[PDB]
PDB file of C-alpha atoms and ligand atoms in Angstrom:
ATOM      1  CA  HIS E   4      -1.532  81.277 -75.108  1.00  0.00           C
ATOM      2  CA  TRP E   5      -3.444  79.539 -77.874  1.00  0.00           C
ATOM      3  CA  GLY E   6      -6.748  80.914 -78.900  1.00  0.00           C
ATOM      4  CA  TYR E   7      -8.727  82.080 -82.067  1.00  0.00           C
ATOM      5  CA  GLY E   8      -7.266  85.476 -82.866  1.00  0.00           C
ATOM      6  CA  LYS E   9      -4.990  86.538 -85.560  1.00  0.00           C
ATOM      7  CA  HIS E  10      -1.869  85.848 -83.780  1.00  0.00           C
ATOM      8  CA  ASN E  11      -2.699  82.946 -81.949  1.00  0.00           C
ATOM      9  CA  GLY E  12      -5.249  80.871 -84.000  1.00  0.00           C
ATOM     10  CA  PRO E  13      -5.326  77.648 -85.376  1.00  0.00           C
ATOM     11  CA  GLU E  14      -2.694  78.256 -88.014  1.00  0.00           C
ATOM     12  CA  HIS E  15      -0.226  78.743 -85.076  1.00  0.00           C
ATOM     13  CA  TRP E  16      -1.048  75.928 -82.837  1.00  0.00           C
ATOM     14  CA  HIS E  17       1.557  73.762 -84.462  1.00  0.00           C
ATOM     15  CA  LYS E  18       4.383  75.511 -83.015  1.00  0.00           C
ATOM     16  CA  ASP E  19       3.430  74.453 -79.423  1.00  0.00           C
ATOM     17  CA  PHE E  20       1.456  71.346 -80.369  1.00  0.00           C
ATOM     18  CA  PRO E  21       3.477  69.870 -83.345  1.00  0.00           C
ATOM     19  CA  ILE E  22       0.684  67.103 -83.725  1.00  0.00           C
ATOM     20  CA  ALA E  23      -1.553  69.575 -85.262  1.00  0.00           C
ATOM     21  CA  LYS E  24       0.116  68.336 -88.354  1.00  0.00           C
ATOM     22  CA  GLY E  25      -0.450  64.786 -87.358  1.00  0.00           C
ATOM     23  CA  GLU E  26      -2.105  61.927 -89.262  1.00  0.00           C
ATOM     24  CA  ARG E  27      -5.225  61.967 -87.366  1.00  0.00           C
ATOM     25  CA  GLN E  28      -6.432  65.520 -86.850  1.00  0.00           C
ATOM     26  CA  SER E  29      -9.868  66.786 -86.396  1.00  0.00           C
ATOM     27  CA  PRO E  30     -12.210  68.300 -87.533  1.00  0.00           C
ATOM     28  CA  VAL E  31     -12.548  66.861 -91.161  1.00  0.00           C
ATOM     29  CA  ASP E  32     -14.947  67.517 -94.234  1.00  0.00           C
ATOM     30  CA  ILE E  33     -17.247  64.735 -94.378  1.00  0.00           C
ATOM     31  CA  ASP E  34     -17.792  64.102 -98.019  1.00  0.00           C
ATOM     32  CA  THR E  35     -21.189  62.278 -98.199  1.00  0.00           C
ATOM     33  CA  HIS E  36     -20.420  61.046-101.713  1.00  0.00           C
ATOM     34  CA  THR E  37     -17.139  58.959-100.695  1.00  0.00           C
ATOM     35  CA  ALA E  38     -18.190  58.016 -96.972  1.00  0.00           C
ATOM     36  CA  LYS E  39     -19.185  54.448 -97.375  1.00  0.00           C
ATOM     37  CA  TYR E  40     -22.029  52.765 -95.546  1.00  0.00           C
ATOM     38  CA  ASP E  41     -20.826  49.968 -93.116  1.00  0.00           C
ATOM     39  CA  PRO E  42     -23.520  47.361 -92.269  1.00  0.00           C
ATOM     40  CA  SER E  43     -21.135  46.081 -89.316  1.00  0.00           C
ATOM     41  CA  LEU E  44     -21.896  49.410 -87.312  1.00  0.00           C
ATOM     42  CA  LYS E  45     -24.508  49.295 -84.665  1.00  0.00           C
ATOM     43  CA  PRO E  46     -27.069  51.735 -83.535  1.00  0.00           C
ATOM     44  CA  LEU E  47     -25.644  54.105 -81.103  1.00  0.00           C
ATOM     45  CA  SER E  48     -26.808  53.594 -77.438  1.00  0.00           C
ATOM     46  CA  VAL E  49     -27.160  57.038 -75.678  1.00  0.00           C
ATOM     47  CA  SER E  50     -27.821  56.320 -71.958  1.00  0.00           C
ATOM     48  CA  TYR E  51     -28.313  59.453 -70.275  1.00  0.00           C
ATOM     49  CA  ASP E  52     -31.259  59.057 -67.950  1.00  0.00           C
ATOM     50  CA  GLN E  53     -28.958  59.260 -64.778  1.00  0.00           C
ATOM     51  CA  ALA E  54     -26.763  62.080 -66.033  1.00  0.00           C
ATOM     52  CA  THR E  55     -25.844  64.337 -63.252  1.00  0.00           C
ATOM     53  CA  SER E  56     -24.824  67.873 -64.404  1.00  0.00           C
ATOM     54  CA  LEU E  57     -22.836  69.644 -61.636  1.00  0.00           C
ATOM     55  CA  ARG E  58     -21.452  73.060 -63.104  1.00  0.00           C
ATOM     56  CA  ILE E  59     -20.793  75.339 -66.189  1.00  0.00           C
ATOM     57  CA  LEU E  60     -17.666  77.024 -66.680  1.00  0.00           C
ATOM     58  CA  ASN E  61     -16.139  79.679 -68.969  1.00  0.00           C
ATOM     59  CA  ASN E  62     -12.640  78.300 -69.658  1.00  0.00           C
ATOM     60  CA  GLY E  63     -11.651  81.005 -71.994  1.00  0.00           C
ATOM     61  CA  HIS E  64     -12.226  78.957 -75.092  1.00  0.00           C
ATOM     62  CA  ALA E  65     -15.712  77.860 -74.713  1.00  0.00           C
ATOM     63  CA  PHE E  66     -17.865  77.070 -72.133  1.00  0.00           C
ATOM     64  CA  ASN E  67     -18.175  73.546 -70.554  1.00  0.00           C
ATOM     65  CA  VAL E  68     -21.230  72.044 -68.801  1.00  0.00           C
ATOM     66  CA  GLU E  69     -19.603  69.499 -66.421  1.00  0.00           C
ATOM     67  CA  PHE E  70     -21.033  66.020 -65.211  1.00  0.00           C
ATOM     68  CA  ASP E  71     -20.306  63.445 -62.543  1.00  0.00           C
ATOM     69  CA  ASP E  72     -18.285  60.888 -64.287  1.00  0.00           C
ATOM     70  CA  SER E  73     -17.387  58.864 -60.872  1.00  0.00           C
ATOM     71  CA  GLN E  74     -20.111  56.199 -61.950  1.00  0.00           C
ATOM     72  CA  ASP E  75     -21.717  54.892 -65.185  1.00  0.00           C
ATOM     73  CA  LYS E  76     -24.561  57.567 -64.884  1.00  0.00           C
ATOM     74  CA  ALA E  77     -24.514  58.879 -68.725  1.00  0.00           C
ATOM     75  CA  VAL E  78     -22.866  56.675 -71.077  1.00  0.00           C
ATOM     76  CA  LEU E  79     -22.278  56.004 -74.749  1.00  0.00           C
ATOM     77  CA  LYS E  80     -21.832  52.629 -76.089  1.00  0.00           C
ATOM     78  CA  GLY E  81     -22.571  50.601 -79.200  1.00  0.00           C
ATOM     79  CA  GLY E  82     -22.182  52.442 -82.648  1.00  0.00           C
ATOM     80  CA  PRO E  83     -18.548  51.913 -83.677  1.00  0.00           C
ATOM     81  CA  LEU E  84     -17.414  51.543 -79.872  1.00  0.00           C
ATOM     82  CA  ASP E  85     -16.145  48.852 -77.925  1.00  0.00           C
ATOM     83  CA  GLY E  86     -16.951  49.224 -74.318  1.00  0.00           C
ATOM     84  CA  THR E  87     -18.456  51.938 -72.353  1.00  0.00           C
ATOM     85  CA  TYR E  88     -17.619  55.743 -72.449  1.00  0.00           C
ATOM     86  CA  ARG E  89     -18.853  58.154 -69.764  1.00  0.00           C
ATOM     87  CA  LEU E  90     -19.847  61.548 -70.172  1.00  0.00           C
ATOM     88  CA  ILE E  91     -17.534  64.219 -68.759  1.00  0.00           C
ATOM     89  CA  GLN E  92     -18.561  67.411 -70.253  1.00  0.00           C
ATOM     90  CA  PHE E  93     -20.120  69.156 -73.325  1.00  0.00           C
ATOM     91  CA  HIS E  94     -19.383  72.198 -75.022  1.00  0.00           C
ATOM     92  CA  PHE E  95     -19.939  74.021 -78.211  1.00  0.00           C
ATOM     93  CA  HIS E  96     -18.082  75.793 -81.162  1.00  0.00           C
ATOM     94  CA  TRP E  97     -19.803  78.550 -83.006  1.00  0.00           C
ATOM     95  CA  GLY E  98     -19.604  81.507 -85.354  1.00  0.00           C
ATOM     96  CA  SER E  99     -19.829  85.349 -85.548  1.00  0.00           C
ATOM     97  CA  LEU E 100     -22.349  84.824 -88.400  1.00  0.00           C
ATOM     98  CA  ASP E 101     -24.891  82.182 -88.941  1.00  0.00           C
ATOM     99  CA  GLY E 102     -22.805  80.864 -92.088  1.00  0.00           C
ATOM    100  CA  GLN E 103     -19.969  79.662 -90.051  1.00  0.00           C
ATOM    101  CA  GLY E 104     -19.182  77.905 -86.782  1.00  0.00           C
ATOM    102  CA  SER E 105     -19.028  74.319 -86.936  1.00  0.00           C
ATOM    103  CA  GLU E 106     -15.923  72.557 -86.985  1.00  0.00           C
ATOM    104  CA  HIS E 107     -16.930  69.475 -89.035  1.00  0.00           C
ATOM    105  CA  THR E 108     -18.302  70.201 -92.367  1.00  0.00           C
ATOM    106  CA  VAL E 109     -20.529  68.200 -94.629  1.00  0.00           C
ATOM    107  CA  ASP E 110     -19.686  68.496 -98.351  1.00  0.00           C
ATOM    108  CA  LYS E 111     -17.903  71.693 -97.431  1.00  0.00           C
ATOM    109  CA  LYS E 112     -21.061  73.249 -95.582  1.00  0.00           C
ATOM    110  CA  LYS E 113     -20.412  75.033 -92.301  1.00  0.00           C
ATOM    111  CA  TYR E 114     -23.287  74.997 -89.920  1.00  0.00           C
ATOM    112  CA  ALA E 115     -23.867  77.780 -87.277  1.00  0.00           C
ATOM    113  CA  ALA E 116     -22.330  75.795 -84.209  1.00  0.00           C
ATOM    114  CA  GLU E 117     -21.412  72.276 -83.226  1.00  0.00           C
ATOM    115  CA  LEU E 118     -22.218  70.628 -79.889  1.00  0.00           C
ATOM    116  CA  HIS E 119     -19.483  68.032 -78.548  1.00  0.00           C
ATOM    117  CA  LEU E 120     -20.398  65.650 -75.880  1.00  0.00           C
ATOM    118  CA  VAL E 121     -17.284  64.248 -74.701  1.00  0.00           C
ATOM    119  CA  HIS E 122     -16.942  60.589 -73.294  1.00  0.00           C
ATOM    120  CA  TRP E 123     -14.067  58.733 -71.881  1.00  0.00           C
ATOM    121  CA  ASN E 124     -13.455  54.925 -72.098  1.00  0.00           C
ATOM    122  CA  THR E 125     -14.085  53.343 -68.610  1.00  0.00           C
ATOM    123  CA  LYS E 126     -11.310  50.860 -69.306  1.00  0.00           C
ATOM    124  CA  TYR E 127      -8.699  53.655 -68.758  1.00  0.00           C
ATOM    125  CA  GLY E 128     -10.067  54.614 -65.238  1.00  0.00           C
ATOM    126  CA  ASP E 129      -9.794  58.564 -65.797  1.00  0.00           C
ATOM    127  CA  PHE E 130      -9.936  61.178 -68.529  1.00  0.00           C
ATOM    128  CA  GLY E 131      -6.563  62.081 -68.237  1.00  0.00           C
ATOM    129  CA  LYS E 132      -5.350  58.531 -68.679  1.00  0.00           C
ATOM    130  CA  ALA E 133      -7.823  57.999 -71.621  1.00  0.00           C
ATOM    131  CA  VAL E 134      -6.552  60.936 -73.630  1.00  0.00           C
ATOM    132  CA  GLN E 135      -3.220  59.059 -74.010  1.00  0.00           C
ATOM    133  CA  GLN E 136      -4.742  56.340 -75.576  1.00  0.00           C
ATOM    134  CA  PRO E 137      -6.062  55.886 -79.523  1.00  0.00           C
ATOM    135  CA  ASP E 138      -9.506  54.617 -78.134  1.00  0.00           C
ATOM    136  CA  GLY E 139      -9.672  56.874 -75.190  1.00  0.00           C
ATOM    137  CA  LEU E 140     -12.361  59.116 -76.002  1.00  0.00           C
ATOM    138  CA  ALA E 141     -15.732  59.173 -78.070  1.00  0.00           C
ATOM    139  CA  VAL E 142     -17.015  62.412 -79.010  1.00  0.00           C
ATOM    140  CA  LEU E 143     -20.476  62.745 -80.148  1.00  0.00           C
ATOM    141  CA  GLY E 144     -20.931  65.769 -82.503  1.00  0.00           C
ATOM    142  CA  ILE E 145     -24.136  67.421 -83.373  1.00  0.00           C
ATOM    143  CA  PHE E 146     -24.481  70.354 -85.874  1.00  0.00           C
ATOM    144  CA  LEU E 147     -26.648  73.437 -84.978  1.00  0.00           C
ATOM    145  CA  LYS E 148     -28.628  75.444 -87.505  1.00  0.00           C
ATOM    146  CA  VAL E 149     -30.499  78.552 -86.844  1.00  0.00           C
ATOM    147  CA  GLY E 150     -34.184  78.382 -87.148  1.00  0.00           C
ATOM    148  CA  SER E 151     -36.779  77.292 -84.467  1.00  0.00           C
ATOM    149  CA  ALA E 152     -35.502  77.461 -80.817  1.00  0.00           C
ATOM    150  CA  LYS E 153     -34.325  74.463 -78.865  1.00  0.00           C
ATOM    151  CA  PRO E 154     -36.372  74.462 -75.756  1.00  0.00           C
ATOM    152  CA  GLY E 155     -33.744  72.077 -74.273  1.00  0.00           C
ATOM    153  CA  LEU E 156     -31.010  74.702 -74.653  1.00  0.00           C
ATOM    154  CA  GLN E 157     -32.858  77.518 -73.044  1.00  0.00           C
ATOM    155  CA  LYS E 158     -31.555  76.781 -69.456  1.00  0.00           C
ATOM    156  CA  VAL E 159     -27.797  76.727 -70.541  1.00  0.00           C
ATOM    157  CA  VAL E 160     -28.582  80.073 -72.527  1.00  0.00           C
ATOM    158  CA  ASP E 161     -30.026  81.753 -69.574  1.00  0.00           C
ATOM    159  CA  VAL E 162     -27.015  80.897 -67.234  1.00  0.00           C
ATOM    160  CA  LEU E 163     -24.672  82.492 -69.647  1.00  0.00           C
ATOM    161  CA  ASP E 164     -24.803  85.841 -68.162  1.00  0.00           C
ATOM    162  CA  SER E 165     -23.224  84.529 -64.922  1.00  0.00           C
ATOM    163  CA  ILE E 166     -20.265  82.922 -66.757  1.00  0.00           C
ATOM    164  CA  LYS E 167     -19.534  85.944 -69.118  1.00  0.00           C
ATOM    165  CA  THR E 168     -15.729  86.082 -68.677  1.00  0.00           C
ATOM    166  CA  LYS E 169     -12.884  83.455 -68.473  1.00  0.00           C
ATOM    167  CA  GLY E 170     -12.825  81.576 -65.322  1.00  0.00           C
ATOM    168  CA  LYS E 171     -16.135  82.201 -64.160  1.00  0.00           C
ATOM    169  CA  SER E 172     -18.159  79.148 -63.058  1.00  0.00           C
ATOM    170  CA  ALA E 173     -21.893  78.581 -61.762  1.00  0.00           C
ATOM    171  CA  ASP E 174     -23.754  75.624 -60.320  1.00  0.00           C
ATOM    172  CA  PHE E 175     -25.610  73.781 -63.037  1.00  0.00           C
ATOM    173  CA  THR E 176     -27.576  70.904 -61.493  1.00  0.00           C
ATOM    174  CA  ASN E 177     -30.193  68.939 -63.132  1.00  0.00           C
ATOM    175  CA  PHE E 178     -29.735  69.476 -66.773  1.00  0.00           C
ATOM    176  CA  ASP E 179     -30.744  67.090 -68.977  1.00  0.00           C
ATOM    177  CA  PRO E 180     -28.494  66.570 -72.128  1.00  0.00           C
ATOM    178  CA  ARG E 181     -31.320  64.692 -73.883  1.00  0.00           C
ATOM    179  CA  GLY E 182     -32.647  67.672 -74.885  1.00  0.00           C
ATOM    180  CA  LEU E 183     -29.905  68.663 -77.097  1.00  0.00           C
ATOM    181  CA  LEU E 184     -30.172  65.391 -79.147  1.00  0.00           C
ATOM    182  CA  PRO E 185     -31.846  65.334 -82.826  1.00  0.00           C
ATOM    183  CA  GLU E 186     -34.686  62.917 -83.544  1.00  0.00           C
ATOM    184  CA  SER E 187     -32.339  60.477 -85.469  1.00  0.00           C
ATOM    185  CA  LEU E 188     -29.041  58.763 -84.378  1.00  0.00           C
ATOM    186  CA  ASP E 189     -27.796  58.276 -87.745  1.00  0.00           C
ATOM    187  CA  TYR E 190     -24.176  59.117 -87.975  1.00  0.00           C
ATOM    188  CA  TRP E 191     -20.740  59.226 -89.528  1.00  0.00           C
ATOM    189  CA  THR E 192     -17.894  58.015 -87.735  1.00  0.00           C
ATOM    190  CA  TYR E 193     -14.057  58.328 -88.209  1.00  0.00           C
ATOM    191  CA  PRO E 194     -10.812  58.238 -86.005  1.00  0.00           C
ATOM    192  CA  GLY E 195      -9.358  61.747 -84.985  1.00  0.00           C
ATOM    193  CA  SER E 196      -8.363  64.009 -82.307  1.00  0.00           C
ATOM    194  CA  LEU E 197      -9.320  66.754 -79.940  1.00  0.00           C
ATOM    195  CA  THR E 198     -10.158  69.945 -81.942  1.00  0.00           C
ATOM    196  CA  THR E 199      -8.280  72.040 -79.381  1.00  0.00           C
ATOM    197  CA  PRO E 200      -4.594  71.879 -77.840  1.00  0.00           C
ATOM    198  CA  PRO E 201      -3.349  69.314 -77.003  1.00  0.00           C
ATOM    199  CA  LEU E 202      -4.791  67.954 -80.120  1.00  0.00           C
ATOM    200  CA  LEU E 203      -4.429  64.528 -79.018  1.00  0.00           C
ATOM    201  CA  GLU E 204      -5.442  61.646 -81.396  1.00  0.00           C
ATOM    202  CA  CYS E 205      -7.444  59.667 -79.098  1.00  0.00           C
ATOM    203  CA  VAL E 206     -11.056  60.332 -80.472  1.00  0.00           C
ATOM    204  CA  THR E 207     -13.571  58.044 -82.105  1.00  0.00           C
ATOM    205  CA  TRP E 208     -15.657  60.635 -83.647  1.00  0.00           C
ATOM    206  CA  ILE E 209     -19.343  60.047 -84.008  1.00  0.00           C
ATOM    207  CA  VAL E 210     -20.998  63.107 -86.029  1.00  0.00           C
ATOM    208  CA  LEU E 211     -24.823  62.842 -86.234  1.00  0.00           C
ATOM    209  CA  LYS E 212     -26.499  63.359 -89.634  1.00  0.00           C
ATOM    210  CA  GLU E 213     -29.411  65.572 -88.280  1.00  0.00           C
ATOM    211  CA  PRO E 214     -28.744  68.750 -87.080  1.00  0.00           C
ATOM    212  CA  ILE E 215     -30.747  70.759 -84.314  1.00  0.00           C
ATOM    213  CA  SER E 216     -32.230  73.885 -84.737  1.00  0.00           C
ATOM    214  CA  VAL E 217     -31.647  76.940 -82.216  1.00  0.00           C
ATOM    215  CA  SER E 218     -33.121  80.324 -82.689  1.00  0.00           C
ATOM    216  CA  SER E 219     -31.272  83.210 -83.490  1.00  0.00           C
ATOM    217  CA  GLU E 220     -31.767  84.743 -79.997  1.00  0.00           C
ATOM    218  CA  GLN E 221     -30.045  81.712 -78.590  1.00  0.00           C
ATOM    219  CA  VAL E 222     -27.055  82.019 -80.789  1.00  0.00           C
ATOM    220  CA  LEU E 223     -26.897  85.636 -80.116  1.00  0.00           C
ATOM    221  CA  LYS E 224     -26.429  84.910 -76.381  1.00  0.00           C
ATOM    222  CA  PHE E 225     -23.488  82.586 -77.169  1.00  0.00           C
ATOM    223  CA  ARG E 226     -21.988  85.470 -78.906  1.00  0.00           C
ATOM    224  CA  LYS E 227     -22.286  87.664 -75.903  1.00  0.00           C
ATOM    225  CA  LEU E 228     -19.553  85.620 -74.060  1.00  0.00           C
ATOM    226  CA  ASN E 229     -16.282  86.698 -73.650  1.00  0.00           C
ATOM    227  CA  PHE E 230     -12.782  85.089 -74.283  1.00  0.00           C
ATOM    228  CA  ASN E 231     -11.019  87.499 -71.731  1.00  0.00           C
ATOM    229  CA  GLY E 232     -11.305  87.630 -67.966  1.00  0.00           C
ATOM    230  CA  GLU E 233     -13.173  90.075 -65.727  1.00  0.00           C
ATOM    231  CA  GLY E 234     -11.372  93.409 -65.874  1.00  0.00           C
ATOM    232  CA  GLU E 235      -9.598  92.805 -68.960  1.00  0.00           C
ATOM    233  CA  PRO E 236     -10.319  94.386 -72.687  1.00  0.00           C
ATOM    234  CA  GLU E 237     -13.600  92.675 -73.677  1.00  0.00           C
ATOM    235  CA  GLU E 238     -13.084  90.308 -76.905  1.00  0.00           C
ATOM    236  CA  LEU E 239     -16.229  88.383 -77.710  1.00  0.00           C
ATOM    237  CA  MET E 240     -16.201  84.719 -77.878  1.00  0.00           C
ATOM    238  CA  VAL E 241     -17.038  83.946 -81.419  1.00  0.00           C
ATOM    239  CA  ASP E 242     -15.383  81.961 -84.065  1.00  0.00           C
ATOM    240  CA  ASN E 243     -14.106  79.414 -81.464  1.00  0.00           C
ATOM    241  CA  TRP E 244     -13.869  76.589 -84.248  1.00  0.00           C
ATOM    242  CA  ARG E 245     -10.688  74.891 -85.846  1.00  0.00           C
ATOM    243  CA  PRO E 246     -11.194  74.436 -89.746  1.00  0.00           C
ATOM    244  CA  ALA E 247     -11.174  71.195 -91.387  1.00  0.00           C
ATOM    245  CA  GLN E 248      -7.980  69.138 -91.419  1.00  0.00           C
ATOM    246  CA  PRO E 249      -6.660  66.674 -94.004  1.00  0.00           C
ATOM    247  CA  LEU E 250      -8.262  63.339 -93.948  1.00  0.00           C
ATOM    248  CA  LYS E 251      -4.987  61.550 -94.750  1.00  0.00           C
ATOM    249  CA  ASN E 252      -5.164  57.941 -94.558  1.00  0.00           C
ATOM    250  CA  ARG E 253      -8.743  57.755 -93.037  1.00  0.00           C
ATOM    251  CA  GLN E 254     -12.067  56.573 -94.146  1.00  0.00           C
ATOM    252  CA  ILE E 255     -15.324  58.010 -92.865  1.00  0.00           C
ATOM    253  CA  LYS E 256     -18.164  55.344 -92.412  1.00  0.00           C
ATOM    254  CA  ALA E 257     -21.765  55.856 -92.357  1.00  0.00           C
ATOM    255  CA  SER E 258     -24.297  54.255 -90.075  1.00  0.00           C
ATOM    256  CA  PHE E 259     -27.052  54.712 -92.712  1.00  0.00           C
ATOM    257  CA  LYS E 260     -27.723  53.990 -96.375  1.00  0.00           C
TER     258      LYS E 260
HETATM  259 ZN1   ZN Z 301     -15.144  70.786 -79.077  1.00  0.00          ZN
END
């Protein structure tokens, strides 16, 4: 029964998921004055040309756009990573107001939202095995600010009416995740965790420096989603973000000077 309310939000998660107070929790604040350039970091390789989206699902905490991860169709490699990581889903976290919504922060700045493209390391065979490993997942995080519309998001926005409430799904084929990327692939990277229960410390985070812009109408449609199921009391799906956690014994590395 975890969520983002008063009685079940991030500050309660540790009772059921004690690693919430662990050594490698996410998100974190990215201090651009202490992150150090690492010349051994390689460019990211994002290979999404054969991506096969299947479905979109309201899981009661966000919505997931799901992919076929039974072949190396949409993969992330390079950067800080060893090996090949397959895209399984993306989702967002967003606010009730444009001044909050992101999970990571940059010099304490909160963005309106944050996109997470979730990938698992093919050496572990399946997502469920990957999340048990410290190098099991690679999550590409992309900030959203409100400004111009993002044309490549509009197909997602327009399906949201069909998945208003928890447990609803809809076919969602032929969606191209390349339309969600910024121009630059400059990034920060650090070792961390899932940002939702079970909060497993299995993620190499790759957070892009450059935000994407979405329109105020686009974000407004995110905020019409519901956390509840159909026929239950309506509670708008907003503020589904975990705040920054202690960095502890970690360094954030930058791919760029
Ligand atoms: Zn996420």
